[PDB]
Design a binder for this molecule. Sequence first.
Ligand SMILES: [Mg+2]
Ligand SMILES: [Mg+2]
Ligand SMILES: [Mg+2]
Ligand SMILES: [Mg+2]
Ligand SMILES: [Mg+2]
Ligand SMILES: [Mg+2]
Ligand SMILES: [Mg+2]
Ligand SMILES: [Mg+2]
Ligand SMILES: [Mg+2]
Ligand SMILES: [Mg+2]
Ligand SMILES: [Mg+2]
Ligand SMILES: [Mg+2]
Ligand SMILES: [Mg+2]
Ligand SMILES: [Mg+2]
Ligand SMILES: [Mg+2]
Ligand SMILES: [Mg+2]
Ligand SMILES: [Mg+2]
Lengths: 345, 201, 190
Amino acid sequence: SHRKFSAPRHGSLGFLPRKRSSRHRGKVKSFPKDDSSKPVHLTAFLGYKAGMTHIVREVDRPGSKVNKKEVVEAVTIVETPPMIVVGIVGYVETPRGLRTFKTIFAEHISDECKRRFYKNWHKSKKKAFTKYCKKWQDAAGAAALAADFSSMKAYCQVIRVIAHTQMRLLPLRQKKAHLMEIQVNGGTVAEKLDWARERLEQQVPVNQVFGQDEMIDVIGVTKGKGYKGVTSRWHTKKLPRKTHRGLRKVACIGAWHPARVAFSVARAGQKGYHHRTEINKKIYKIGQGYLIKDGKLIKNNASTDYDLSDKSINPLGGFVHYGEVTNDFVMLKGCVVGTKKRVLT
Amino acid sequence: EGQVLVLDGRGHLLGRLAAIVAKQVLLGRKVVVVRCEGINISGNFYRNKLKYLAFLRKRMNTNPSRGPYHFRAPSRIFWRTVRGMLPHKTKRGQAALDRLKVFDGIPPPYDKKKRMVVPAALKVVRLKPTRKFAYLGRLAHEVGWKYQAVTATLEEKRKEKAKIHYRKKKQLMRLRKQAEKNVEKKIDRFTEVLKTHGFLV
Amino acid sequence: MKTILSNQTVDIPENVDITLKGRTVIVKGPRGTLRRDFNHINVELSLLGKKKKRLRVDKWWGNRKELATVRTICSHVQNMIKGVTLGFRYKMRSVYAHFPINVVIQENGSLVEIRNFLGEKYIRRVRMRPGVACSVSQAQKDELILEGNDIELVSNSAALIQQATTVKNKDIRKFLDGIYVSEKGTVQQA
RNA sequence: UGGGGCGAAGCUACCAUCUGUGGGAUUAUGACUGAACGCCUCUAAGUCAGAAUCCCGCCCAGGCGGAACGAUACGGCAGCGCCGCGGAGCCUCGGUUGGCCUCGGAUAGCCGGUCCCCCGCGGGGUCCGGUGCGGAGUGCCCUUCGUCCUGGGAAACGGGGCGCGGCCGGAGAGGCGGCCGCCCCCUCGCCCGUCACGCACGCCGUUCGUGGGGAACCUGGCGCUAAACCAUUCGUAGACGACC
RNA sequence: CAAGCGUUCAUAGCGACGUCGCUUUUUGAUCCUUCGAUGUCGGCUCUUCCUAUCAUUGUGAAGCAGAAUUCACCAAGCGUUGGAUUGUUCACCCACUAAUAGGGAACGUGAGCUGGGUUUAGACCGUCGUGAGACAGGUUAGUUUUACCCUACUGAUGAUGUG
RNA sequence: AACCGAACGCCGGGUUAAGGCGCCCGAUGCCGACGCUCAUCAGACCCCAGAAAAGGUGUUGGUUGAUAUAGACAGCAGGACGGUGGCCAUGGAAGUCGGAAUCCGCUAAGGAGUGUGUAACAACUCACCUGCCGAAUCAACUAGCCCUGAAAAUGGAUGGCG
Ligand SMILES: [Mg+2]
Ligand SMILES: [Mg+2]
Ligand SMILES: [Mg+2]
Ligand SMILES: [Mg+2]
Ligand SMILES: [Mg+2]
Ligand SMILES: [Mg+2]
Ligand SMILES: [Mg+2]
Ligand SMILES: [Mg+2]
Ligand SMILES: [Mg+2]
Ligand SMILES: [Mg+2]
Ligand SMILES: [Mg+2]
Ligand SMILES: [Mg+2]
Ligand SMILES: [Mg+2]
Ligand SMILES: [Mg+2]
Ligand SMILES: [Mg+2]
Ligand SMILES: [Mg+2]
Ligand SMILES: [Mg+2]
């Protein structure tokens, strides 16, 4: 017999191998469509979550009840010091998918970047990238990187730029940088390459990638919550106070005919630590780190022109539960996925 | 015959071909069907789309990741149809399928090999000219390929290339024929003995 | 019953020069050149008349339903000839009670721009097909002129704006407004 | 948890806050051209518009599915990768010339040649001339298959030394070609003489792709010179396991 | 099919006398399976499917001017609520809306619950019985097991393969 | 189970029944006949495992009746009148809500009317009859094949593949 009294399902399936994520720096899954006409830019970056705050903006939505009123918007602040480009990488299109030719990273490399290779390192001899580098100065420094780029010019189509974060600058206890390919959505390969050629080894800050008031999408991993019963996980009903064996459950899993519990019935399971792509968040402010020309500029952070104090976004006693944001943040409308200190793509 | 087979899927009939492939796979002969986008089907476009979409609804309710795999690439689609004509539960049937091999477009090694055509699965022969149809390419697209565009642009790139070879090969034959005439009185009593027992007339 | 033969000759004028690539007829006269493929219909197109006087379409081992088509090819060919000699002109007269349908062509032909049909704020836009030169008439009040060589192309394009202009959730017995075709003719008449 | 105010941290609530994103095929339907059916016709051959549909895209998982590139065990005893070229021996098998290429049309094609014309040795065009139950035919082409003698003719610079360096071209999942110097060596396809090769005394797995695939060990040259896991710590995570 | 209604007019909408079907959400027949007993009514929760479309998208109808409305097509994409009474399924009313469509899955779902009703043993009235006692005639009290085992599913380690 | 053939010591060869013969899967890897149909739900075998009245110029055959070089059919042009507010009905019905009826002239041919519609006309149209064209045309039945009628619940079965 039918359900007497209809209702929506509890919690979407288009979402549902609700497992502990296999990765942790939010992997970008789709890089925007490179229209070959507009200039070369990077399409992504890699900040990290600090904390949050009361922003007060004047509004300009003619028609609304709040035309020209003050409102407070809750905002995150994403600590985003500049990212170094180490290596470039070329993808060719195929019937079978999108295979990768030729990864080439720089002479030099870094040391934080090294970290994101050999698991336990104080044990290691730190040998990574020691015979690669040797190529950035000889006769075979002209073969396998020159004939190579010529190759990546010829047959290749889509070019990303491997870039490692500067972990050192942060208050995190972490020293292990966050490498990621960031696609270049430029105009034409070669132009989209004699450029990455040039930005090897080189600082890349947030004001290249991003503009203040661009809608962006944040890609990161949900804040962890352990095993949860069905009522916390799938957010179901509770059964009444009477029930002999547990009231934080689902009564009926299935009909004693499709003789399997289904796909799509509510269950106990890992909640949180899930990968998630949140979209279309606004940038309220692109920041600037407190740098020196004489004696600090803490001012150049939270000092809007309509108040002109000398604040840093750092509240009194840090962003509780990591620390002080000492370089370029981006201030994002509302809340973003993930806990504090979290790598946020 | 012996050795590896290469069949050029274009202009064939999806299952009519696959029955012939599958017979020879079971006789130990290695077949390689190529260019499966080109493979075509009797009945009008939509008919077989509608018939495919019927497939896609067939799906193991209690978990679908177990349930039937409705592969979308024509290679894969055809494989399926060949496979249904093998006894693939058993060891000889899986050992059979391994002798098959199937591509969308026409790849390395197989660009570079001459390649054959089953007239008894060939559309112009098997069908009437006043009847309608799908290309498994377009069918495959509207069902969830991602790679009709790519395997187009690559095949156009291959065609342009292959044309060069065809033209250079064309130019060697013109040399052969001119060099027969430029030496036809010290091979004029060998060519004799050719044309006498049939060869070369 | 299969009919051994059916055929038809199109009488081609002295102006035009058709030249058929196998089955594909191309036609060039004064106005321009048209092309069309009968790579479906399956017939034998001969150009028997010397100097150049006859297209003859055969059909040959054909049953009833393909015998039909002898005459249809024969038509799209006359219909080309009239197009490349004379050229067609569909006129379409806007119609109303009240809100003046307010047309404005906007590259050359191409964009036919329609404010105010029935007080509607949404400005309907309509593309023409290639080779179809729309233009607002004169010597008459609410009246477009769609000029082109190709019947096929000229009459989708009539119909596109004739159908873009349709009322909804009313009596279309009563609400007799929109733009619609009044006169299918030619540019030059002879 | 003696009681109760207030209460950081942490969980957590349309009880606070933030964010929910795009294409394609077309149904019904509406249409264009237009046949049957010397008219009319949404259709018989052709087209067009068309959605909470369907499929896809963003989104989530990620294969007895692949990618790229890092480093490759100094040693106190180690063990290997190449490269080449050397000697035995478990085993697991299938095979027993190759074919090195257009595109597609099918009530049509193939090729030649352009005198002529346009484009980038090529491509396109036009004219003519041949083939088209196809003879620069997958009914297809090629290459040979007992050995060497030597002493004529026909044929004469062909081939070789894992002969040796350089420049190409080829990337869809290349794995292959191609094209240039120099050393030494050899003189082979077809006719013929002319002799020869254990002639095993009618007998079977004969012949090769075979320096197969893989698993164990005897020579030289050049390079090499760890990471992983545990323990510890941290928590970004928690049952334990897993992870940062 | 079709006699009628519909001012007129068969067939916008309807439609008699007849007649051809489906359907298994109604009850019957039947007695094929189970009596070394498959938990026997309702409610809650929770999935999924069907369409026999109540809403909404796109459409064709009307006796469609608008407004409002019914007929029908693709169509099952997302909807179908809060209560008073009632063991109830079933009902009726208030209320909201956009709708308050209809159904299936062992008459979906007792090692999910509850146990209100059925349907033990205690009791009470009605009637019948001479009586023990009977009564789809009323009424109040009445123990609701066991998961560790294979499976499905949800997560979690992992696995041969890639030196 | 129960249909069809066929009744079974254990084997080699040959041969068959009922069945089959793209491939699963043995056999058509006949240069097999002659047909019919294209299904936006095809069809595809005695039980047995699906449909009906009823539809259906979807196409193919008949059957019968028609029409016509005195030149039809179809197409484009002209008339479609008068005797005549004919009679009943008046509420209007002069051809026309309805009916008895109900026939001549001009004839060419025009029904005292098929309809639109009009309160009634008109105005329009249709029978009838002409003008223009050139040879086959039309109607009712009846069958063959397909289309519709045709709507169900874990996903989906000519056996599957096709
Ligand atoms: Mg419901
Ligand atoms: Mg209890
Ligand atoms: Mg209305
Ligand atoms: Mg569309
Ligand atoms: Mg249509
Ligand atoms: Mg369209
Ligand atoms: Mg009546
Ligand atoms: Mg039991
Ligand atoms: Mg329906
Ligand atoms: Mg209640
Ligand atoms: Mg039940
Ligand atoms: Mg129980
Ligand atoms: Mg149960
Ligand atoms: Mg009780
Ligand atoms: Mg009792
Ligand atoms: Mg008493
Ligand atoms: Mg008594």
